[PDB]
């Protein structure tokens, strides 16, 4: 359990494997980054380009500069910022499109809160890296749009048409239920507002950060279970029995992050207690001694090992270790990284990470790059460990 060795292995992995892979996807002919790479490492240069992917690339290279001081990474972030500003930002109705073509032609023009949140997250990180206030101004405008067009008493309406007329929340629902409230969307609003507030100390941003933290404590968390509600209606009634172990452990450390900034000391204590309760129950129920399982939908336990779940497990257990100094969390975090190294890091040349292996540890055919597989979960796992003192 050598933490210095752990950190230097993560830094070496980030610099030798993850950063060069994502740099190789830069699209200098059309802007942005290539949108898709299949299981066999074939890039589709003409694939549509997802906005979540672009914003996660923007966040990643900006954070690489902020932590490692790599000027080349800052340039790669600039490239992602330009494509966001020029192609993903809707000149007619504002906010970010869901996807554009390889040329930047709008393809899916619907406006989802999840996409706007990742815009805020990446733009605020880019402001820190570049000093370019326009990025912070765009982040603040996305914040204003979420608060004034998308927010209601019980949280955010999650999906809209291009012109901000409400729509059914299908892109963020799963398991055959159309959920109008998802923990997933609300968690990434919380994440983006934490990063925004960290860099922009405005009362309106603070109050919205406290508000979404309170929603997690009072409505989304199921007290004493270590579990968050997953897919709900607008009253946060669960539409299906479901537990997402990866979202639980990601929420644990993201809630602790936000708690740093709370001025309500009672709330802060409740949040820190809740975050540890989630970490403890997740370790007990989902960690098998090498890695974390995925989710339970109704009675079906998915024991596949998903790349982003294991990444968030390393961060979430390392955070629980830092808070408690209980060695069990440190051991679980390092063991999960060893699992990743052995089973999810791609051994082919000039590759990255695999999407998943099944319970039997066999790789399943899945893309390496797409709208939902980016450098954010795995890059952040490295950057977060490196950052912490
Ligand atoms: O159901 C939405 C979408 O969720 C994807 O898993 C995502 C992941 C994307 O890398 O990032 C989270 O938001 C973590 O906070 C997860 O919810 C899933 O891969 C994708 O299939 C699904 O459509
Ligand atoms: Cl561009
Ligand atoms: Cl805590
Ligand atoms: Cl990602």
SS3 track for the chain: CCHHHHHHHHHHHHHHHHHHHHHCCECCCCCCECCCECCCCCECCCCCEEHHHHHHHHHHHHHHHHHHCCHHHHHHHHHHHHHHHHHHECCCCCCECCEECCCCCEEECCEEHHHHHHHHHHHHHHHHHHCCHHHHHHHHHHHHHHHHHHEECCEECCEECCCCCECCCCCCCCCCCCCCEEHHHHHHHHHHHHHHHHHCCCHHHHHHHHHHHHHHHHHHEECCCCEECCEECCCCCECCCEEEHHHHHHHHHHHHHHHCCCCCHHHHHHHHHHHHHHHHHHHHHHECCCCECCEEECCEEECCEEHHHHHHHHHHHHHHHHHHCCHHHHHHHHHHHHHHHHHCECCCCCCCECCEECCCCCECCCCCEECCECCHHHHHHHHHHHHCC
The resolution of the experimental structure, rounded to one decimal in Å, is 1.6
What atom of ligand 1 comes closest to residue 244's alpha carbon?
17
Give, as residue ranges, everything with CB less than 5 Å from ion ligand 4: 374, 376-377
Alpha carbons 103 and 87: distance in angstroms, whole number: 9
Task: Pick the ligand that lies closest to the CA of residue 270.
Answer: 3
What atom of ligand 1 comes closest to residue 52's alpha carbon?
9
Q: How was this structure determined?
A: X-ray
Token digits of residue 381: 């796992």
Ligand 1 binding pocket includes 39 (Cβ within 6 Å): no
Placement of tokens 């059309």 in the chain: 30
Token digits of residue 26: 């830069």
Do 296 and 243 form a contact (C-beta atoms < 8 A)?
A: yes
Spatial strand order of the sheet with 242-244 comes to: 242-244, 295-297, 300-302
What atom of ligand 1 comes closest to residue 250's alpha carbon?
15
Q: Which has the closest alpha carbon to 282: 249, 314, 251, 258?
A: 249
DSSP lists the bridge partners of residue 222 as 227
Give the list of residues 6+ apart from residue 82 with CB closer than 8 angstroms, or none. 31
**Nearest 5 degrees, angle CA 191-CA 178-CA 114?**
20
Nearest residue (CA) to ligand 1, atom 19: 372
Ligand 1 binding pocket includes 311 (Cβ within 6 Å): no
Ligand 1 binding pocket includes 250 (Cβ within 6 Å): yes
The rounded Å distance from CA 382 to ligand 1 centre is 19
Alpha carbons 194 and 185: distance in angstroms, whole number: 14
Ligand 1 binding pocket includes 186 (Cβ within 6 Å): no
Alpha carbons 175 and 243: distance in angstroms, whole number: 12
Alpha carbons 123 and 130: distance in angstroms, whole number: 10
What atom of ligand 1 comes closest to residue 114's alpha carbon?
13
Alpha carbons 179 and 298: distance in angstroms, whole number: 16
End-to-end CA distance of the chain: 16
Do 36 and 29 form a contact (C-beta atoms < 8 A)?
A: no
Give the list of residues 6+ apart from residue 310 with CB closer than 8 angstroms, or none. 291, 292, 336, 339, 340, 344
R_g over Cα of the chain: 19
Alpha carbons 331 and 20: distance in angstroms, whole number: 29
Ligand 1 binding pocket includes 372 (Cβ within 6 Å): yes
DSSP lists the bridge partners of residue 243 as 296
The rounded Å distance from CA 377 to ligand 4 centre is 4
Alpha carbons 268 and 258: distance in angstroms, whole number: 9
Alpha carbons 344 and 322: distance in angstroms, whole number: 26
Ligand 1 binding pocket includes 172 (Cβ within 6 Å): yes
What are the φ and ψ backbone dihedral angles of 45, each rounded to 5 degrees? -65, -30
Alpha carbons 159 and 170: distance in angstroms, whole number: 8
Q: CA separation (Å) from 158 to 51, 108, 180, 191? A: 16, 15, 7, 16
Q: Give the rounded distance of the alpha carbon of 54 from its chain centre.
A: 13
Do 156 and 208 form a contact (C-beta atoms < 8 A)?
A: no
130-165 burial, b if ≥16 CB within 10 A, otherwise e? beeeebbebbbbbbebbbebbbeeebbbbbbebebe
Query: Counting Cβ atoms within 10 Å, is residue 28 exposed (0-12), middle (13-18) or buried (19+)?
Result: exposed
Residues belonging to the chain: 389
Site to probe by mutation for ligand 1, drawn from 185, 309, 372 as the one with most ligand atoms within 8 Å of Cβ, is: 372
DSSP lists the bridge partners of residue 106 as 100
Alpha carbons 43 and 94: distance in angstroms, whole number: 31
Q: Three-class SS string for 36-84?
A: CECCCCCECCCCCEEHHHHHHHHHHHHHHHHHHCCHHHHHHHHHHHHHH
């Amino acid at each position: 359990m050598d933490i210095t060795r752990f950190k230097e292995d993560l830094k070496a992995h980030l610099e030798e494997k993850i950063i060069p892979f994502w740099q190789s996807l830069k699209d200098d002919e059309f802007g942005g980054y290539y949108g898709y790479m299949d299981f066999n490492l074939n890039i589709d240069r003409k694939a549509q380009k997802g906005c979540i992917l672009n914003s996660r690339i923007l966040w990643f290279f900006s954070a690489c500069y902020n932590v490692l001081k790599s000027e080349k990474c800052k340039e790669m972030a600039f490239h992602a910022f330009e494509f966001l500003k020029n192609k993903f930002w809707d000149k007619e109705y504002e906010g970010l499109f869901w996807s554009v073509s390889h040329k930047g032609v709008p393809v899916d023009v619907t406006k989802h809160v999840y996409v706007q949140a990742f815009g805020i997250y990446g733009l605020s990180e880019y402001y820190e890296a570049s000093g370019d206030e326009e990025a912070l101004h765009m982040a603040k405008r996305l914040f204003e749009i979420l608060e004034t067009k998308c927010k209601r008493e019980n949280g955010y309406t999650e999906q809209f048409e291009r012109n901000w007329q409400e729509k059914e929340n299908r892109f963020l629902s799963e398991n055959g239920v159309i959920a109008s409230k998802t923990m997933n969307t609300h968690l990434h609003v919380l994440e983006s507002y934490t990063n925004l507030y960290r860099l922009l100390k405005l009362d309106d941003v603070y109050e919205a950060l406290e508000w979404i933290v309170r929603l997690f404590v009072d409505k989304i968390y199921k007290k004493g279970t270590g579990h968050f509600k997953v897919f709900c209606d607008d009253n946060w009634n669960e539409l299906i029995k479901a537990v997402s172990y990866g979202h639980d452990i990601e929420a644990s450390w993201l809630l602790d992050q936000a708690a740093k900034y709370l001025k309500d000391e009672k709330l802060k204590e409740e949040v820190e207690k809740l975050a540890l309760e989630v970490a403890q129950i997740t370790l007990k129920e989902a960690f098998d001694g090498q890695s974390l399982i995925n989710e339970m939908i109704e009675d079906r336990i998915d024991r596949s090992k998903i790349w982003w779940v294991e990444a968030e497990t390393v961060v979430g257990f390392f955070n629980a270790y830092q808070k408690t100094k209980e060695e069990k969390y440190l051991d679980a975090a390092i063991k999960t990284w060893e699992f990743i190294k052995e089973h999810l890091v791609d051994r082919r040349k000039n590759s990255e990470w695999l999407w998943k292996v099944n319970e039997d540890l066999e790789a399943v055919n899945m893309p390496i790059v797409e709208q939902w597989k980016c450098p954010y979960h795995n890059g952040r796992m490295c950057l977060e460990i490196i950052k912490r003192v």
